[PDB]
Amino acid sequence: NDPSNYQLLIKNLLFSPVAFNPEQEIVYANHRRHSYKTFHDRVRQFANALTKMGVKKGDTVAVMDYDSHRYLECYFAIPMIGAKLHMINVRLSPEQILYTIDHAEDDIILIHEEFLPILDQIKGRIDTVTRYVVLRDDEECEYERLLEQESTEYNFPDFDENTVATTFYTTGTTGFPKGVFFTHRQLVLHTMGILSTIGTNASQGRLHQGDIYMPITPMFHVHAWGLPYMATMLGVKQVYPGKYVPDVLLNLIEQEKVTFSHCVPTILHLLLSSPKSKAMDFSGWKVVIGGAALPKALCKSALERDIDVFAGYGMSETGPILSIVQLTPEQLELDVDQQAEYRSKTGKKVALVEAYIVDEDMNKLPHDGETAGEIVVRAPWLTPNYYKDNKNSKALWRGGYLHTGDVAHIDDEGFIKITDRVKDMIKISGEWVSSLELEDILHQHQSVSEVAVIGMPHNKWGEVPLALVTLKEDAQVTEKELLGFAKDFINKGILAREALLLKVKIVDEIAKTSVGKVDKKELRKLHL
Amino acid sequence: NDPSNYQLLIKNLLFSPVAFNPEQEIVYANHRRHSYKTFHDRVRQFANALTKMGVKKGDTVAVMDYDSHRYLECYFAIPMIGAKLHMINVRLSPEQILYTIDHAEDDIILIHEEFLPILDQIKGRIDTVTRYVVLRDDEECEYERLLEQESTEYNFPDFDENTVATTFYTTGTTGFPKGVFFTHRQLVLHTMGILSTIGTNASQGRLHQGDIYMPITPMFHVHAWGLPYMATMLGVKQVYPGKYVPDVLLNLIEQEKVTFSHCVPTILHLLLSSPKSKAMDFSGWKVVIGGAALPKALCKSALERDIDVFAGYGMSETGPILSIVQLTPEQLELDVDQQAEYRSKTGKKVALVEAYIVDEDMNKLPHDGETAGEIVVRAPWLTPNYYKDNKNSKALWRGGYLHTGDVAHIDDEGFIKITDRVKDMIKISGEWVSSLELEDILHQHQSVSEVAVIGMPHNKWGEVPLALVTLKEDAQVTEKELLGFAKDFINKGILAREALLLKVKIVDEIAKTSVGKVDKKELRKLHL
Amino acid sequence: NDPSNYQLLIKNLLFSPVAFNPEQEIVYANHRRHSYKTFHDRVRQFANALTKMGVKKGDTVAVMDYDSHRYLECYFAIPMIGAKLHMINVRLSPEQILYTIDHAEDDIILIHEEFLPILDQIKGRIDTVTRYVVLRDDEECEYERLLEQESTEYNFPDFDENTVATTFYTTGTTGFPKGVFFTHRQLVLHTMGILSTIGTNASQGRLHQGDIYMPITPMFHVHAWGLPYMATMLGVKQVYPGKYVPDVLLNLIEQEKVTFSHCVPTILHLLLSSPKSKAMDFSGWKVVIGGAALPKALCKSALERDIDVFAGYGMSETGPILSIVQLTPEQLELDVDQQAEYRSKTGKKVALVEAYIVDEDMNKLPHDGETAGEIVVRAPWLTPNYYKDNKNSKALWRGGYLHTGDVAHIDDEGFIKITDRVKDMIKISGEWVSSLELEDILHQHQSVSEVAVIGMPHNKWGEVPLALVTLKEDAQVTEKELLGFAKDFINKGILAREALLLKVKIVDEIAKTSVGKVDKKELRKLHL
Numbered sequence A, B, C: 001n002d003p004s005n006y007q008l009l010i011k012n013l014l015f016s017p018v019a020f021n022p023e024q025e026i027v028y029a030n031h032r033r034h035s036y037k038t039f040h041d042r043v044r045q046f047a048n049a050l051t052k053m054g055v056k057k058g059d060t061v062a063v064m065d066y067d068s069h070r071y072l073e074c075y076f077a078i079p080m081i082g083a084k085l086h087m088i089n090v091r092l093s094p095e096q097i098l099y100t101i102d103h104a105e106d107d108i109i110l111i112h113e114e115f116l117p118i119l120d121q122i123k124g125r126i127d128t129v130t131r132y133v134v135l136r137d138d139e140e141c142e143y144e145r146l147l148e149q150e151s152t153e154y155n156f157p158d159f160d161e162n163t164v165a166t167t168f169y170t171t172g173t174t175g176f177p178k179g180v181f182f183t184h185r186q187l188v189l190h191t192m193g194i195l196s197t198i199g200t201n202a203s204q205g206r207l208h209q210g211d212i213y214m215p216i217t218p219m220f221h222v223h224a225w226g227l228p229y230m231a232t233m234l235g236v237k238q239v240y241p242g243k244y245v246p247d248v249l250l251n252l253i254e255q256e257k258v259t260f261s262h263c264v265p266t267i268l269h270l271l272l273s274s275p276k277s278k279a280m281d282f283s284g285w286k287v288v289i290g291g292a293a294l295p296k297a298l299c300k301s302a303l304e305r306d307i308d309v310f311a312g313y314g315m316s317e318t319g320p321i322l323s324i325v326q327l328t329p330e331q332l333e334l335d336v337d338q339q340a341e342y343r344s345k346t347g348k349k350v351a352l353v354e355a356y357i358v359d360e361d362m363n364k365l366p367h368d369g370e371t372a373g374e375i376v377v378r379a380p381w382l383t384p385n386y387y388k389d390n391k392n393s394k395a396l397w398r399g400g401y402l403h404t405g406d407v408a409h410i411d412d413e414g415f416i417k418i419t420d421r422v423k424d425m426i427k428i429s430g431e432w433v434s435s436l437e438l439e440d441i442l443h444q445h446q447s448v449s450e451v452a453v454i455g456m457p458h459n460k461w462g463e464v465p466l467a468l469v470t471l472k473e474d475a476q477v478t479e480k481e482l483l484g485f486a487k488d489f490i491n492k493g494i495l496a497r498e499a500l501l502l503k504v505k506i507v508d509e510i511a512k513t514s515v516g517k518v519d520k521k522e523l524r525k526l527h528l
């Protein structure tokens, strides 16, 4: 090629990092410890092993494990050869896993032992896959046995920076999972642009070279929010817990002295409510809870335990990271509650992100902080389209912009506050209300446990909300009282307070997606 | 173009920054203050004004001023239109300035009033230049008068990220100045990769969003080491001093509370030895002295005044920044003197930089910390070649690598220590000694003020060093004593200690380059 | 390549000439004589020697000598290999020579011994040049020593006819010398089109196969007006004088019986006024004085000595030859003075030349013989542009035509008469007068030796002429008498006879260009 024409490749994130201490440790929880030198040696050994299998530049290798050093080595060796890395969402149903495997046309499959029963239900219908490698936590692992037979020397090639590196098949509301892919250039730009925006903070929520990293996210969802690529560039100590057990997670955090991690609101609540956390010192921890809609009460409870809690925002199609909550030095004086309300927002855009707010006609509503609209974005690390799709790709990049699909209002200071989802919007009459505030209102009820609000067509008012509630243990309140519970609230538009047609219903169970989210579209078949 | 195909442009560094406070100030010393909103308005106004002159996408605009808000607006508006920016080295002789102006084929020239006498000696022979704009510090400036007539609205175009943005004509040892150019992609990658490597430090020498920036470098040398582009991305307060007067510089630092700056070893020594600095509080300052060869004694003297002093390294062809001294937390315990010896080194490579050490055959000598060799580099922000040159371009990028031209030894920990220059090397016999250590040795003499060491051919030993010294006031020591002064030292190779042919000579004055450096090549005509 | 696709190459001018006598002599004055067979052998030997040095097809070889057989062999061997030939103007200042050498990026330099002191002032700053070959007039010449070691056999390649062959850096009024280049096709077309236009004359001023050739021009100015290429195509005897000494030139002309030559008006005047020319028979000589503005009195004096004197016209950018004075048979009956006035004109265009007369708007003024305008031309042997320049190239080929830069009026018979230069024009008010006629008028003064006329701005009349004169030995006439001297003349327009603001000044010395021409632009700095 051209030596003066530099190419942004993943291999430059490992051999040309910000810092490199050869004696820094990679730790797999109570199973393995090894320095960075041996980590590089193992990456070269895995590259040699993959070359021995016949994995060419255009091939695809699919991984099905937990979080471990094996997944970190796969995040590097497979893209550096040239082949694509397919992160398989374990939490999907086996039929969806079969669909993704056949769609991506994988060649090798690295599957953990605990996921063997799933593959038994599907291996029969799987084609195009030649070799299965079984990963174990003991000395009889096939990955280790294939590493031991290779050498620690390899010459990684130089190719175009626009070669695809990863794919993970997100699964929104489309009927089938949609495949999103990224290149070497996009991933390098992502890690650079996030390290330049969160490392430069003054005193709050910064990731520097003295931190100790831990992922508490599935790490196959989306590149583990890109953080494993950043942590290895800073050359920091990394700890991988494995199966996400709170009893083990707290022990690892206290013992390995973890200072930076990221999780979801349910995992954080589980960690806080554990009784192995009442005498545990948390005043060194920096959780970025960017899963979905960090609650204010949970943020306040975490802040009472001395924890640097701040939310983030991104999706499978966007790198993922698009916005991160960063507090200016004069905002950290606020109190127990005004800090909770600032930290739980969506956050300000990160560097090299545009993030306008538009209407169904693309009209770019003002950022007054009151009017809501869809978020449309432009960034260096957005997927160009869906894999093998064309009409969903056009819907994704309509109007020369990527459509996120979330309805939010941007404050004048730049703070974003996600209000609801586009498909979950209530276009009653000519206004667009959100189902999240109604869901929050009928949750404050002392007898309701889980609530869901969906739309119901009305000839003279378009479509109107419908309320579904689940009662608590030995709690029986009639629908009329539940209606009157929301009828006391104030400060909303439409007829009176849009309270003449709530139409609440009591349902014993509400359908859920296997991921663990409320399934409104399935709900909209059962009742209408 | 393609909306999904992102282009790394300079305009994204201004409208998509890491932080943006509209009320943050840009200050031109005791002359002007204005917020960031008015700074953006003035950038748009200057874009409109340049469009009115007929400045097209391929044109070139040349600037000849000091450091001011005008130079910051030129760093952005001119590249964002598409035209090239020519930073003219004021300190060059008028003949060299004429050569650079005619070589670059400029169209507009922005020249400060104080540089008018230079242009009088040259305007006669200048062609291809149509309009001259005279910049003044009062209200009658033509730049301000041309800004006032335009509007604060502009739509900046989108073009290829490989379009040239800047050029500044470095002037090494070639007979004529050599032109080096960079693109939008290279500058954006430079600012991202340096913000991601110096902002992420734990506690020492980090540039964050709470700092206040000041350039104490000519700011036309090389992009002011890229720091003005970084400071505006963090949205920090910026102060521009103008003419570099220590009496004014100290007042500005104390009054504007500057916390981050960069200068050269002579300017720092001038600031420290000023008597307006004996009662001045310096324990908030972060000077990066990356000009040339930060002395150890000056570093110790600065450290005694509570100043975060650390050296950097780069050149005109390399972005510029290639290495920065970063101290790990266990290295800050050391004492008054071991910290001085760590801070004055060349430093470790920055992220995305290779920086091997080679020999005349390209053989990649080991990094044992003792063997010296030339530094060869690969980085995302290196100039591909010299402008309108071909044979010097091949010499620059020989062997698939950029040749820096400096002889250094890399320590095993990664610390670099520049020893000498390639053209200043002494290949006596079969060994290569450096003239800098001999220069340092005969400087310790109580009677010598300035010393210069050059080579002298010897039939049986190739070429040998020759010593030139300048005596102090009313000091007269014969050459024999000066010879014997170096004959006491030990710990060197070659015959005894290479002390049988020093050949010291006493010269009243030593030729100097107009920039302010010792001219050895001119010296090598007068005496041999 | 394609054998049926003929390419016009320089090698076809030597091996396929109009005539070829193997026993015809090439004579270097009192130093060397050798036939055409040995000339071809030496050309092949020099091609072999250049190949041995590593001179490739794209290389450049620069020559710095007088006129000799060596320069004739360089005119052929270097272009026939494929490399470019750089004729270096010796008469330029060493700084300009350095600029041209660095601009052309020469590889080999053939320099005569007498020019060694110049190279001593510059060799230090010269890069890209590897080998220096020193030419001498004795047996110890390095050119001869390198010829003797090669063989007289070579196979010259066939390449595209559009490959550059020569470059010589003209130096007009631009601040720096401008490089003009020509191809094989252009040179072959030039020699063909001039041999077909001057060989076909009836009885006056024709170059045929019976002539004996001599160059009395620097021969590096512009291809020696292309005449060495023509003389070798006719296979005529060629004599080269060397250093241009009139005592030697007259002896060579009388002894070698030279019948065709070309010089400049100063050299011809020197030859005529020599007292070794009073008994010398000149009635066989055919001087083409095409240097600059052949005077009428000198032409008459030469005609009184039986010499076929006629002027020519061309420039560095135009081949050079564009027009030659050719007299029809009925024009040779005229007398002592009407023949002088016909022979001293610019001449009629040569074959394949357009040569219109235009105004500042390109409006193609009529050829009535009274109205003056700029000459614009189209010809097969014009340089397309300046080397490494773009804005001067557009000024050169403005309006789809090459602009010569001389103001002349074309007579209806086709005779051209150059009046002045464009930059030396006086646009007083709305008319354009010429400074040459005013210069001629104040020269007739018995006390004035050298005169120069330049423009001086006037608010109500634009710019007006200013007269500078130099008095003779022991001659002191006041400015008023000099004014009144021009006030007696008649037959001109403007106010009376434009005689109310002559503004004559007496200056002891007038600045001159090192070439030997009046420097008006430098004059226009000293006084205004």
Ligand SMILES: COC(=O)CCCCCC(=O)OP(=O)(O)OC[C@H]1O[C@@H](n2cnc3c(N)ncnc32)[C@H](O)[C@@H]1O
Binding pocket: A170, A222, A225, A288, A289, A290, A291, A292, A293, A294, A311, A312, A313, A314, A315, A316, A317, A320, A321, A323, A324, A345, A346, A404, A405, A406, A418
């Ligand atoms: C700081 O780093 C991060 O937080 C990266 C988070 C990446 C999450 C990716 C994921 O959740 O992919 P998808 O299944 O497509 O998720 C899309 C939806 O996730 C919701 N979301 C994410 N973060 C949110 C915050 N802070 N508030 C509300 N909702 C959030 C969005 O609705 C998004 O469409």
Ligand SMILES: COC(=O)CCCCCC(=O)OP(=O)(O)OC[C@H]1O[C@@H](n2cnc3c(N)ncnc32)[C@H](O)[C@@H]1O
Binding pocket: C170, C222, C225, C288, C289, C290, C291, C292, C293, C294, C311, C312, C313, C314, C315, C316, C317, C320, C321, C323, C324, C345, C346, C404, C405, C406, C418
């Ligand atoms: C018959 O062959 C020739 O005479 C060829 C002459 C080639 C001359 C080239 C040379 O003089 O290159 P430049 O320095 O650019 O010269 C340009 C100016 O020379 C003046 N000139 C030439 N011949 C002239 C005549 N006959 N009359 C007036 N002026 C003449 C021109 O001004 C031209 O621009």
Ligand SMILES: [C]OC(=O)[C][C][C][C][C]C(=O)O=P([O])([O])O[C][C]1O[C](N2[C]=NC3=C2N=[C]N=C3[N])[C]([O])[C]1[O]
Binding pocket: B170, B222, B225, B288, B289, B290, B291, B292, B293, B294, B311, B312, B313, B314, B315, B316, B317, B320, B321, B323, B324, B345, B346, B404, B405, B406, B418
């Ligand atoms: C951090 O940042 C920084 O520092 C940057 C810097 C830049 C600079 C540039 C210049 O200087 O260009 P030029 O002129 O080319 O230069 C070159 C040279 O320089 C020197 N240096 C620098 N630095 C240093 C040095 N030395 C030693 N040390 C240090 N540190 C070198 O030599 C080069 O070559």
Ligand SMILES: [Mg+2]
Binding pocket: A170, A172, A315, A316, A317
């Ligand atoms: Mg999504």
Ligand SMILES: [Mg+2]
Binding pocket: B170, B172, B315, B316, B317
């Ligand atoms: Mg340099």
Ligand SMILES: [Mg+2]
Binding pocket: C170, C172, C315, C316, C317
């Ligand atoms: Mg000319």
